[PDB]
Amino acid sequence: ILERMESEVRTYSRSFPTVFTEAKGARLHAEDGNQYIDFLAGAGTLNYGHNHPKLKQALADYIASDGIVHGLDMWSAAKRDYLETLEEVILKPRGLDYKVHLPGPTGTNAVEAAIRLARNAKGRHNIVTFTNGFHGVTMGALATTGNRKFREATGGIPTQGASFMPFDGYMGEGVDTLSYFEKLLGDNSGGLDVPAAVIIETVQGEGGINPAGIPWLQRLEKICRDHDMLLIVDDIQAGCGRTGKFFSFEHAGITPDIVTNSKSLSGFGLPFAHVLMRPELDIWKPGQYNGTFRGFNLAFVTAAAAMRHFWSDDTFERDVQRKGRVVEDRFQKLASFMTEKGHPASERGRGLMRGLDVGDGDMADKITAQAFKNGLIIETSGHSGQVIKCLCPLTITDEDLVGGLDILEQSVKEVFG
Amino acid sequence: TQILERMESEVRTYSRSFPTVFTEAKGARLHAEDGNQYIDFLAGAGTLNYGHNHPKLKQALADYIASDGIVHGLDMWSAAKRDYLETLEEVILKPRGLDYKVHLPGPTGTNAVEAAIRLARNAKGRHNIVTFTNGFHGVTMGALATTGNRKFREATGGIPTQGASFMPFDGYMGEGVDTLSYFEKLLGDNSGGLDVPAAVIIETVQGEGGINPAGIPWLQRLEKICRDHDMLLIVDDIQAGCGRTGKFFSFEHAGITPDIVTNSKSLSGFGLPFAHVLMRPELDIWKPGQYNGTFRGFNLAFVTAAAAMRHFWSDDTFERDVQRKGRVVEDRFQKLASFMTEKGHPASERGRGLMRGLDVGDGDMADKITAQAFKNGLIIETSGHSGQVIKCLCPLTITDEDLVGGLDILEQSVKEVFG
Amino acid sequence: QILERMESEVRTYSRSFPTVFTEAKGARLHAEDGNQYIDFLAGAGTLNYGHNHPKLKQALADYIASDGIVHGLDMWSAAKRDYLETLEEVILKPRGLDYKVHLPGPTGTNAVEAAIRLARNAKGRHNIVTFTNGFHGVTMGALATTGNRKFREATGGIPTQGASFMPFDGYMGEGVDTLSYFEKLLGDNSGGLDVPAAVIIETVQGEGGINPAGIPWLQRLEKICRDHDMLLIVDDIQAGCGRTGKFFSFEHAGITPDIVTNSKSLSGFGLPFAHVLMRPELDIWKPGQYNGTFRGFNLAFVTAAAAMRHFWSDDTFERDVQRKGRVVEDRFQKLASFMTEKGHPASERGRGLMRGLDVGDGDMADKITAQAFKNGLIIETSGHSGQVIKCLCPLTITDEDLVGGLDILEQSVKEVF
Amino acid sequence: TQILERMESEVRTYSRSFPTVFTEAKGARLHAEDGNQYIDFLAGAGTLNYGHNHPKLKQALADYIASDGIVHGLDMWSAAKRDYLETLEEVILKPRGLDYKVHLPGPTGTNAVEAAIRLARNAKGRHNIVTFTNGFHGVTMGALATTGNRKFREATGGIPTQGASFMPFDGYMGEGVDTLSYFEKLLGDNSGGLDVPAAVIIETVQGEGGINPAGIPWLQRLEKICRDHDMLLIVDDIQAGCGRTGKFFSFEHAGITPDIVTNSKSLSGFGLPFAHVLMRPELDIWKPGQYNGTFRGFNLAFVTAAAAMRHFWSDDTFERDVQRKGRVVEDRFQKLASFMTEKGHPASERGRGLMRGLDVGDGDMADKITAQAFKNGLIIETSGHSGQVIKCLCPLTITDEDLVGGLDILEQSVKEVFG
Numbered sequence A: 001i002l003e004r005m006e007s008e009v010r011t012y013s014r015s016f017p018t019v020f021t022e023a024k025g026a027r028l029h030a031e032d033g034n035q036y037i038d039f040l041a042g043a044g045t046l047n048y049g050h051n052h053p054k055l056k057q058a059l060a061d062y063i064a065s066d067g068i069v070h071g072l073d074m075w076s077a078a079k080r081d082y083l084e085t086l087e088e089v090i091l092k093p094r095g096l097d098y099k100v101h102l103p104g105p106t107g108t109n110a111v112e113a114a115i116r117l118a119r120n121a122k123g124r125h126n127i128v129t130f131t132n133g134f135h136g137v138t139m140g141a142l143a144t145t146g147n148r149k150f151r152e153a154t155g156g157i158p159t160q161g162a163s164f165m166p167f168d169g170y171m172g173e174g175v176d177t178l179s180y181f182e183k184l185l186g187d188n189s190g191g192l193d194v195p196a197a198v199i200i201e202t203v204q205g206e207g208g209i210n211p212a213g214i215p216w217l218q219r220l221e222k223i224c225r226d227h228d229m230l231l232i233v234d235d236i237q238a239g240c241g242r243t244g245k246f247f248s249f250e251h252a253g254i255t256p257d258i259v260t261n262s263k264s265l266s267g268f269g270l271p272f273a274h275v276l277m278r279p280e281l282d283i284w285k286p287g288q289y290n291g292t293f294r295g296f297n298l299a300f301v302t303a304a305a306a307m308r309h310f311w312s313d314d315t316f317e318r319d320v321q322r323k324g325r326v327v328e329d330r331f332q333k334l335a336s337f338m339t340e341k342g343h344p345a346s347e348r349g350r351g352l353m354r355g356l357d358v359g360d361g362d363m364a365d366k367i368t369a370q371a372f373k374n375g376l377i378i379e380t381s382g383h384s385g386q387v388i389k390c391l392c393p394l395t396i397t398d399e400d401l402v403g404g405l406d407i408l409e410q411s412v413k414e415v416f417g
Numbered sequence B, D: 001t002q003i004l005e006r007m008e009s010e011v012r013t014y015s016r017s018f019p020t021v022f023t024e025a026k027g028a029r030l031h032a033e034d035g036n037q038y039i040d041f042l043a044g045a046g047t048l049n050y051g052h053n054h055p056k057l058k059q060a061l062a063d064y065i066a067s068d069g070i071v072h073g074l075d076m077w078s079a080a081k082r083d084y085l086e087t088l089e090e091v092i093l094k095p096r097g098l099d100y101k102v103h104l105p106g107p108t109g110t111n112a113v114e115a116a117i118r119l120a121r122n123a124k125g126r127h128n129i130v131t132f133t134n135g136f137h138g139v140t141m142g143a144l145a146t147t148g149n150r151k152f153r154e155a156t157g158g159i160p161t162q163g164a165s166f167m168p169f170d171g172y173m174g175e176g177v178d179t180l181s182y183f184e185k186l187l188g189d190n191s192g193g194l195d196v197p198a199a200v201i202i203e204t205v206q207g208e209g210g211i212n213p214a215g216i217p218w219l220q221r222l223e224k225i226c227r228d229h230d231m232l233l234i235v236d237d238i239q240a241g242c243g244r245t246g247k248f249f250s251f252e253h254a255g256i257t258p259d260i261v262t263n264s265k266s267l268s269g270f271g272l273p274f275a276h277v278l279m280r281p282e283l284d285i286w287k288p289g290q291y292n293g294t295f296r297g298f299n300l301a302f303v304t305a306a307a308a309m310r311h312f313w314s315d316d317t318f319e320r321d322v323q324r325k326g327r328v329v330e331d332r333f334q335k336l337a338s339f340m341t342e343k344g345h346p347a348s349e350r351g352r353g354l355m356r357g358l359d360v361g362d363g364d365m366a367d368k369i370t371a372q373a374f375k376n377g378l379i380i381e382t383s384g385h386s387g388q389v390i391k392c393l394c395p396l397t398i399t400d401e402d403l404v405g406g407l408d409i410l411e412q413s414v415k416e417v418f419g
Numbered sequence C: 001q002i003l004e005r006m007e008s009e010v011r012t013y014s015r016s017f018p019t020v021f022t023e024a025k026g027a028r029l030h031a032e033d034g035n036q037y038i039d040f041l042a043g044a045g046t047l048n049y050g051h052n053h054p055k056l057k058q059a060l061a062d063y064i065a066s067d068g069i070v071h072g073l074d075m076w077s078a079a080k081r082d083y084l085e086t087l088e089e090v091i092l093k094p095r096g097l098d099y100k101v102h103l104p105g106p107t108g109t110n111a112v113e114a115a116i117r118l119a120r121n122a123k124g125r126h127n128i129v130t131f132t133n134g135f136h137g138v139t140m141g142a143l144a145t146t147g148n149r150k151f152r153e154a155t156g157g158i159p160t161q162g163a164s165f166m167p168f169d170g171y172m173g174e175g176v177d178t179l180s181y182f183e184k185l186l187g188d189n190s191g192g193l194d195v196p197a198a199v200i201i202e203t204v205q206g207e208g209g210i211n212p213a214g215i216p217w218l219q220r221l222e223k224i225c226r227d228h229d230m231l232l233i234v235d236d237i238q239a240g241c242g243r244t245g246k247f248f249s250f251e252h253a254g255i256t257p258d259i260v261t262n263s264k265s266l267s268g269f270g271l272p273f274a275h276v277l278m279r280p281e282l283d284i285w286k287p288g289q290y291n292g293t294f295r296g297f298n299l300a301f302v303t304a305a306a307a308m309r310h311f312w313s314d315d316t317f318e319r320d321v322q323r324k325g326r327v328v329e330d331r332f333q334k335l336a337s338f339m340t341e342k343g344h345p346a347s348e349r350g351r352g353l354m355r356g357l358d359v360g361d362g363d364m365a366d367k368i369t370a371q372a373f374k375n376g377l378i379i380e381t382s383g384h385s386g387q388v389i390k391c392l393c394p395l396t397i398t399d400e401d402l403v404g405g406l407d408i409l410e411q412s413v414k415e416v417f
């Protein structure tokens, strides 16, 4: 543990300062024997847990057979199979018609390829983004990202090409934030340049687990159709079954014009990403956008295996909704306890993307560091880090689930004397 | 092929010039479902400097998967990351006299350039970044300001890039004109148009730009210009690094020490997505969490990358073998260039190590040669601004047999097109 | 004529007022056609003392006769020293305003450009907060704070940068406080608002459609600005120089901005002219970071210093503007009364002699405005739709002409019906 | 008289260079309250090309005021507006055979440059604008992107400019080097770094930049380069216009006809803010109202501008008179320059017409001579990337007595400063 070598732009080796060894399911091991229940799961990257056996076999068998790893754009059997499976298993049973673009294997890369697409498809530079939205930190993505910490660090380069509307609930309760947006769309001097696209998370991740209301989602969708705006849904953290459906926008029965995916798309933790799009929007011309690792064949293999093993029927999906309910129940209890001790707290979320909003980052950091000492890995989000996220693996055993929540509850109580 | 055509976006390029379905890959040979077989002179655009699926790297990767090691470490500390950083220091940096620290952005070349220039801009409190004619450093909006190609910059959707100034690269202004004198003057000039730059980003041998090797005197002078004016020197070694030029770091040929180095492509050794930024230790200006990205701790790349460094770079045998093979290509590329000129069609050769280029006149003759080579079983791509430089990006590990075999297919293919 | 071929097709006031004008005095203009016209436009608030006021004419002609320097660059002239002393003795010191003067170029866009540049340098922040419907000029920098879409889309491929829009008072509806949304974003790390160096506002929005800000609203903004370390920039280019019944339109609320821009009626004679008022501590400029050739335009110095002494040496002018404003309000009300009881709803707004009749649509206001020109009244519109007919008559206007002008618009409205 | 120091911002620049109170001015002589009298070789940085308060224009102005003529016309047609478009077409454009229409922006040179490059971007549908080293074209944000001076560009408060690329101006790259070749190469290089411009903006003699006169060949090649690659030519005649170079338009020396022309400084002849944009009629892309400017119809400027075209440009007498005085200025400057060169301080004369410059070593010598000249009765300032160039910008109408008079104070001041 003498890593003087890594930069000072670290995050997770200051919060959880140990050397991790092996991993399976939701259990992680460290060099000193210690074992941890994982409610972080790589920030929503391990929706199927660490090193799932069916994925681990598919990947290994492919490596053993000397399947090409680095394909760039080239057709390969893995790529063909991936697109086959995604259309057969996911897209068609949900009535969705999309073509796939593969950009660089990162969320920010998908986001940059989606907004650039939208900009070219409509002839307009402006992207409407939402309060507390996170979408990545590359200069292009960064324009849609609201966090001052990232934005103040560019080095003298103001972002451009993006306008912020208030997300659902930002002005109170009941207050329609979309009506302000509707008025700005119709006001020539309002200050809102006509957007090529609205970009939205259905449940805001880094922004503090803020799940958009279904009627709100549906009205935004009609607002877009009525105003020649593509709806980009960023399903990079909320998707791949995290909110209890495969795509988080299923709950509202909307069909977004463009969808980005990344984190758990590969199932194993392999860097992977893509951008679904309605066919007619495929206005790209050959080679206008690229990225060395746009053809990561190993990610193709584990993604196909994950779709076939988990999304062939509704069983898994319905088991996430059910696991969500228990996390929801035990977070509400925790907010009740905190509230009655005179520290206001509340619960929100959707599926297994759930949040315990304590007062302030100082309280959340106490509850979190204590849970780490007690054997649970859980982390924060929100503008202040005041929301304790459940981002556990969707596959988590019931013992490991109730086992992690117990450790959380014990840690809250220990913090509260 | 009917699922791949109907469902993949039309932005694709490599499935267009190579319209077959690849399956197995080993060394410098690729297989297709139709029974065709290919010698790979493209190596994923220099991403597979050790060939496809190298035995030694494959076994290290499979062991790690079998033992259930953590794949996605986020940013936490793992044994794979320790072994990577220590291997990096002992095998690579220390014997080269290099004192750097390591920062891990997204597993992407653009992502590394973006962090690199963002770090330079905070270090110096200046926003402008000086770049050179024909440089490519990525397509995400931050990097694109330093990337020269109009086909990308015109597809931004109406956002003009911001933050970069373009300087004439070595040789751009004819022979025997030192382009750095122009640059040196603009720096001293209050109304000359150059916002004072935090950093200069450069490829020692330009990739997409047409295989342009900057001369050793030129590079050394640019290093001194950078110190004489408080500018950081960023060397983008994403393509020209990891052995491609005959030394690990391409800038070793000129004995300069940059302040910031970007690496990607061949860093993993296996075709796993990976990148790091190297900084002089004082430059560690970042505050915690100012930059991130989800696939930083990609541990599988830590294993393959550590494995490649110890296996190929624990001594200088491999180094010198690249040097010798680079010379084989230089010879056959020159001879090929003579053939083409003397048939009324001018051509030249340039490059360094196994980063070589055969400059035919125009992008249409080079397409004819490149496509003919594809029908004869050679995978070879063009670079340059018109598409006129046939580049050798064959694996550094290629066997003499497959190297001469690949160059044999090229020459036949060139003679074939002249008919 | 030669006025149709030689003149570029940008022109605005030569498709609505296509006669050739000759002699001009008070609120009366004479055409070549020989007809007279009553001017309820006053150069859109540039001629707050009417065309060619006798006192100013004389001070001007006397100055040209002695051969006083006309163009002094930056030089100290006697006319420059006089303007500063008069503004000091007659305007600033009696209101207890402590202000330095910076003279930019003689456009109004040039003053806003110098005001926001000053604010950014003072506060070390690039972002400027602007309001829905505001208008502050169309050069590329001032253009970033202007709301109008017809200007921002005509930049030819360059998006604006360094400005964010907040809802102006009332924009979100009845008895909703739009500054509560603004205060929340300031405290929200990721609400998407880069921390402003400055707010820039018109107390009554000119082009936006004659939108008077509430006095408590203005008072709360000033509170928010000091509490959050932001300069308050009041753009009094149109609503200034006694247009709202006080010399500074912010005098109604008792606040004191940090930076005040003036231009239109500053000369008092149609001379191009503008300045930036700034609290002394904010004088962060280094010698010569902002030039502009017609800096020291001594002809305007003469006419602006004469107008101040003549009209603003006491209370009388002030109060007769307030009275004339109440006349206009009584008729605009009676006219919105008429129009509504015929199924065409309308309303009156304003403050002082900056009032507007808000008829329903732009195309209806266009009939009335065009019809008024047929009956001998020049009157133009503003608003996002062109919705609002504005009263921007001179403040010196005689009661015969002010009544005469309103009788023409009253008739011209009836004819439209 | 110390309230001009208290009530005014410290942004002032010509308040510190000449700290007296000026009262009455006529011709090239300015009176002070101190009763001191000054010869003006500055004239509003070239804004009084017919001297201070020319009597003929003074009369035309006085009579329009006396008649209660409309001063602020916005955009409405008026007498004084029609007469200005008439006399411009009749006395100026047609005799020179030029087909131009007029946009009236706000009455500043920045506002003119902004309208022109904004218009150019709309006509060609491209955002980039090529400008040249040491170019100066205004300090509002849009014109600022084309301006070279760091001192203004560092003062924007964290906002980098956007939409402009810099090319080396004629002679920048040394003795006998055609900088335009570099330009043409970048125009055809897909990844050279230049976004394909909508237009090129240039001063035929660079004003603020240090009196750099582009050559006639060079200007003619740049016209050909623009017409070939589909680029408008804007010529920025704010300072070098209205006769200063020997011709009404400084581009007459080269016979080229630009697609866009900007005028402001001396355009009204009387020191009144005023500016127009000259375009070819087919370039009137504008839709109604897309560009604003309150003080566009400033009719008092129409009056004096027309009166000055009639009184000064009806024959070619005046225009050759200035060409004559340019040579007596040119002569003495070379004398003064050979003097300092022989006293061990190299210097040089350059210019064209009555835009002339004496280039000394540095700004500190410039400032010493400039300051001495003020004590001896001559108002003269500098320009250049360091203010190393003592610029002559006396009125074109200066009498021979005052022109040799001013030239004599300058010579006296240089020898005093030396020995």
Ligand SMILES: *Cc1c(COP(=O)(O)O)cnc(C)c1O
Binding pocket: A104, A290, A291, A292, A293, B108, B109, B110, B111, B136, B137, B138, B139, B203, B207, B208, B236, B237, B238, B239, B240, B264, B265
């Ligand atoms: C390959 C290339 C890049 C691009 O990096 P990506 O991973 O493709 O985004 C950057 N720099 C150089 C020198 C390159 O050749």
Ligand SMILES: *Cc1c(COP(=O)(O)O)cnc(C)c1O
Binding pocket: A105, A106, A107, A108, A109, A111, A134, A135, A136, A137, A201, A205, A206, A234, A235, A236, A237, A238, A262, A263, B106, B292, B293, B294, B295
């Ligand atoms: C995780 C997150 C990202 C981050 O993308 P990277 O792969 O880390 O660059 C982007 N968008 C959303 C919605 C996210 O939750």
Ligand SMILES: *Cc1c(COP(=O)(O)O)cnc(C)c1O
Binding pocket: C106, C107, C108, C109, C110, C112, C135, C136, C137, C202, C206, C207, C235, C236, C237, C238, C239, C263, C264, D106, D292, D293, D294, D295
């Ligand atoms: C008129 C207007 C401007 C623009 O001033 P110009 O002289 O036209 O450049 C600026 N601010 C306000 C409030 C305006 O009404």
Ligand SMILES: *Cc1c(COP(=O)(O)O)cnc(C)c1O
Binding pocket: C105, C291, C292, C293, C294, D045, D108, D109, D110, D111, D113, D136, D137, D138, D139, D203, D207, D208, D236, D237, D238, D239, D240, D264, D265
């Ligand atoms: C003087 C100058 C300008 C500045 O115009 P202003 O009148 O100061 O607004 C613009 N372009 C050129 C070439 C100049 O010489």
